[PDB]
Amino acid sequence: DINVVNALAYEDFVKLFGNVVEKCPLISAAIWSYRPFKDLADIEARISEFIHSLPDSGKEGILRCHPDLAGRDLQSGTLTPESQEEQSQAGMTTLDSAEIVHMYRLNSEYKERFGFPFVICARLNNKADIVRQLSERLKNRRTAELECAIEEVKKICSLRLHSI
Amino acid sequence: DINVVNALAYEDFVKLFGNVVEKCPLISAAIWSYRPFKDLADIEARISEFIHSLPDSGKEGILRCHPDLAGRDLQSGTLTPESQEEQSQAGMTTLDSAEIVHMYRLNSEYKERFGFPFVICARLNNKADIVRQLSERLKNRRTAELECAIEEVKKICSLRLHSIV
Numbered sequence: 001d002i003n004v005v006n007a008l009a010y011e012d013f014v015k016l017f018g019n020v021v022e023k024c025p026l027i028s029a030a031i032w033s034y035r036p037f038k039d040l041a042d043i044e045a046r047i048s049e050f051i052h053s054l055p056d057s058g059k060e061g062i063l064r065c066h067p068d069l070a071g072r073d074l075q076s077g078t079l080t081p082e083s084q085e086e087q088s089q090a091g092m093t094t095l096d097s098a099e100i101v102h103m104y105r106l107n108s109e110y111k112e113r114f115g116f117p118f119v120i121c122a123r124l125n126n127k128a129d130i131v132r133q134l135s136e137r138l139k140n141r142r143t144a145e146l147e148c149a150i151e152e153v154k155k156i157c158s159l160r161l162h163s164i
Numbered sequence: 165d166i167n168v169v170n171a172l173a174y175e176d177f178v179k180l181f182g183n184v185v186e187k188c189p190l191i192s193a194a195i196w197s198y199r200p201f202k203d204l205a206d207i208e209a210r211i212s213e214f215i216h217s218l219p220d221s222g223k224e225g226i227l228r229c230h231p232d233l234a235g236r237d238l239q240s241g242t243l244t245p246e247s248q249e250e251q252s253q254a255g256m257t258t259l260d261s262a263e264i265v266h267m268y269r270l271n272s273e274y275k276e277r278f279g280f281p282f283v284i285c286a287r288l289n290n291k292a293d294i295v296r297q298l299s300e301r302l303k304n305r306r307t308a309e310l311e312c313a314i315e316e317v318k319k320i321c322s323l324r325l326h327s328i329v
């Protein structure tokens with residue numbers, strides 16, 4: 001109900017929507033300035049516009065706020081509730097020993113190449129697609145990869161928003 | 165050592181500097197793109213330029229990530245380690261029932277007017293100073309207050325950085 005959303009104090013709006021972009025409450029806090037919203041699509045569009053207004057470093061920064069697939073946070077049970085649901089859904093919590101090592105190596109190569117973590121919309125992909133995509137995007141030039149990666153962020157955000 | 169800072173993996177740089185702007189690790193994460201940093205001043209300069217490049221809503225967003233002085237999070241013991249230290253140093257952790265209620269009302273008026281929390285460099289102000297600032301700044305136009313508040317965020321950030329040093 002967008003009417004209830006529109007009457008939210010900023011503190012409650014930030015509590016409700018503060019993690020639609022992983023560890024970036026500033027982004028959802030910002031868009032509250034554009035209330036009232038027509039609908040959830042309006043909120044989505046504002047978030048996309050905000051991300052797009054950022055310098056490249058800002059986009060890279062958003063990426064760096066995301067946890068590795070199957071990395072330290074997943075293994076240590078210190079993911080945000082959203083990342084935990086997403087990573088479980090993509091098969092990350094039931095990887096075997098060889099798969100864990102493989103994800104480590106792939107993540108390591110990616111982050112060494114690009115200087116931010118590998119991000120892919122987990123809810124839209126299964127385990128096998130994830131590995132294929134890691135390997136494929138590993139071949140991208142940095143500018144093209146930044147665009148690709150941010151598109152994945154925007155997909156994650158849309159799903160998060162619609163899960164609320 | 166700035167050499168040691170420059171050698172940090174982004175994951176470690178974010179871990180160390182991720183809260184120099186309250187609940188805004190994104191800012192520390194972004195500026196790592198600009199390494200090597202010449203010095204501490206370069207880091208602060210990159211932080212300042214990043215914030216300045218945001219739309220006004222982004223600057224408001226940053227403000228909205230800060231907890232109220234003496235507010236719900238302080239009472240619940242759920243402030244960030246830095247925020248707790250800053251507010252304790254400013255005398256917010258030893259207010260009586262009356263004071264706790266009074267902080268609430270001035271903050272309510274302010275946030276209703278401006279649409280973001282009252283932010284002041286707390287390590288540079290005592291109990292009384294804070295109230296006077298709140299009452300004076302309540303008079304500002306919104307355009308001006310945003311600029312005033314963001315300057316305070318940058319002061320807080322500067323001192324958070326120096327504490328790490």
Ligand SMILES: Nc1nc2[nH]cnc2c(=O)[nH]1
Pocket residue numbers: 066067068069082083084086087117118119120121122123156
């Ligand atoms: N959905 C999703 N994709 C990711 N890509 C990298 N980390 C994540 C995560 O936590 N969730």
Ligand SMILES: Nc1nc2[nH]cnc2c(=O)[nH]1
Pocket residue numbers: 230231232233247248250251281282283284285286287320
């Ligand atoms: N230093 C400091 N100033 C503030 N102004 C409003 N909240 C805070 C806070 O947590 N710390």
